[PDB]
Design a binder for this molecule. Structure first.
Ligand code: FAD
Ligand code: NAG
Length: 500
């Protein structure tokens, strides 16, 4: 494999195990610290192209020598699939493929896969205070992965997901052909906008629609005690109102221990605080929030704020490539909720936070509705639309270095929490969020360990219909057309219809 690469691409973009910088390049975007001790995080080579023509030979060498491709842009995949495999593999790391072209007059931008959300937001904000992009929250996330999987954040109720706002793309397929929207066709251009683009090809660049944002947005955040009847009433009404209120207001909810359970309420309102005050006093008067609890800022300042930087920090903090906190290993799972959880079941859920160490486990609510209930189930592969109140996320975290038995304890905790919620969350299929990737919901069999093509597809649909509902089956046909030999494979790759 390595011989084939070195006779075809410059040595300067090739990092093998023997290279002293291999470990830095590997670790630099291993973004879930849980996998820093994974035995499957051992690519034989990391390739870091700096121009497009570097990529086609890596496809050729990968096919000819049986070395599986793992595509990494931001490396934020929550299961670390961009840098692990149980078969011999290499990482095509697109960090240097990162140019951004912003057209303020046409309200559009071309963004290469290795650019981060922070770099995109930075480039927009340097040119206009009133344009934005609803890309998601984390400034270090790569657009290469994010825009292929949905991409949710404080703007999604107002403007849609990141994948709801894509108008062209450049993609390299398994034959090494570099295609745009016109030459890839509408089916494949549909599939990559939220279907997990790495099942179909290597996205080189996305063309996005820029959104009009108000020159003033308003944020607020407060921490309350859960053992407080006003907090409980607010949360009771939150379940019923968060997805139905004014689409300009998005409110997140989080719970952790600190010994009591605290409730974190955080929000962004796409408007001034004079507009926000009557809305909050009509929807949640029990919060008692005054004029001075709302802080006005620009759209990009609100992104800086919610990435744990100072409100008045220079925009350059958006260009940093690692999070502004030291991260703990973690395992998250998520569910979709269509009916309010009963009061006493919510109490039983939150009490499970007492079972592990203080402040290390979390339950979080991300509301749907708004624009997300206006878009059909099949507009793009992302299917989680009207009828969903919120996505409910469960997470356990621990410190780097805990022994195996304690990690298993943490994994078992969050899995049992998930199992306990089966009666109260979506079913048939039990929905799951691709960008909250969870291997526990099902993985592919080894294609050689199936008994038929139908068998391969049906097994894969276990996880497939959870992420995509029946968009999964349209994606199976598209996969069959554009990658019939299954060059792009991994634990949750869309399967082709195998010929024999
Ligand atoms: C670490 C982190 C992740 C976050 C954060 N906040 C999020 C939020 O507010 N909303 C979300 O919806 N997701 C959030 N995430 C998760 C990540 O945004 C998603 O998990 C993305 O999928 C990660 O994208 P990226 O940064 O590129 O990480 P990768 O591992 O490189 O990509 C994930 C996935 O996509 C494939 N892939 C990447 N690049 C390509 C290209 N060019 N072509 C095809 N396929 C590609 C990878 O193989 C992998 O499977 C907040 C934080 C702190
Ligand atoms: C982010 O960029 C700013 C500007 O240089 C810098 O002050 C800050 O330390 C950076 N954040 C990091 C290194 O996490």
């Amino acid at each position: 494999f390595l011989q084939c690469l070195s006779s075809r691409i410059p040595k300067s973009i090739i990092y093998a195990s023997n290279n002293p910088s291999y470990s830095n390049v590997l670790d630099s975007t291993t973004q879930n610290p849980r996998f820093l001790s994974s035995s499957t995080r051992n690519p034989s080579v990391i390739v870091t192209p700096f121009k497009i023509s570097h990529i086609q030979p890596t496809i050729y060498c990968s096919k000819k020598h049986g070395v599986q491709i793992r595509i990494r842009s931001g490396g934020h995949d929550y299961e670390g699939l961009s840098y692990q495999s149980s078969v011999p593999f290499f990482i095509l790391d697109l960090r240097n493929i990162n140019s951004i072209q912003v057209d303020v007059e046409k309200k559009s931008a071309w963004v290469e896969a290795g650019a981060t959300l922070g770099e995109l937001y930075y480039s927009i904000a340097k040119k206009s205070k009133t344009l934005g992009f609803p890309g998601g929250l984390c400034s270090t996330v790569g657009v290469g992965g994010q825009l292929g999987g949905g991409g949710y954040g404080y703007q999604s109720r107002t403007y849609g997901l990141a994948s709801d706002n894509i108008i062209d793309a450049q993609l390299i397929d398994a034959r090494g052909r570099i295609l745009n929207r016109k030459s890839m066709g509408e089916d494949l251009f549909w599939a990559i906008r939220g279907g997990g683009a790495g099942s179909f090809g290597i996205v080189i660049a996305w063309k996005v629609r820029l959104i009009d944002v108000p020159s003033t947005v308003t944020v607020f955040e407060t921490v309350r005690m859960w053992e407080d009847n006003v907090t409980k009433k607010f949360v009771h009404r939150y379940q019923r109102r968060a997805s139905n209120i004014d689409k300009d207001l998005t409110i997140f909810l989080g719970f952790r221990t600190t010994i009591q359970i605290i409730t974190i309420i955080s929000a962004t309102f796409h408007g001034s605080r004079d507009r926000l005050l009557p809305l909050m006093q009509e929807e949640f008067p029990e919060l008692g929030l005054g004029k001075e609890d709302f802080k006005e800022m620009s759209w990009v300042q609100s992104i800086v704020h919610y990435n744990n930087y100072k409100d008045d920090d220079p925009l350059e903090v958006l260009l940093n490539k690692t999070v502004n906190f030291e991260p703990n290993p973690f395992k998250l799972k998520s569910d979709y909720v269509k009916k309010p959880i009963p009061d006493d079941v919510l109490e039983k859920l939150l009490a499970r936070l007492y079972e592990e160490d203080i402040g290390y486990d979390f339950v979080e609510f991300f509301p749907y509705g708004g624009k997300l209930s206006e878009i059909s189930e099949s507009e793009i592969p992302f299917p989680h639309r009207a009828g969903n109140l919120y996505n409910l996320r469960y997470m356990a975290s621990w410190k780097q270095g805990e022994n195996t038995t304690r990690i298993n304890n943490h994994l078992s905790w969050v899995r049992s929490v998930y199992d306990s919620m089966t009666p109260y969350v979506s079913k048939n299929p039990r929905g799951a969020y691709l960008n909250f990737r969870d291997l526990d919901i099902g993985v592919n069999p080894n294609e050689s360990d199936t008994t038929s093509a139908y068998n391969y597809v049906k097994q894969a649909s276990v996880w497939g219909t959870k992420y995509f509902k029946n968009n999964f089956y349209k994606m199976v046909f598209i996969k069959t057309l554009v990658d019939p030999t299954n060059f792009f494979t991994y634990e949750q790759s869309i399967p082709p219809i195998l010929h024999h």
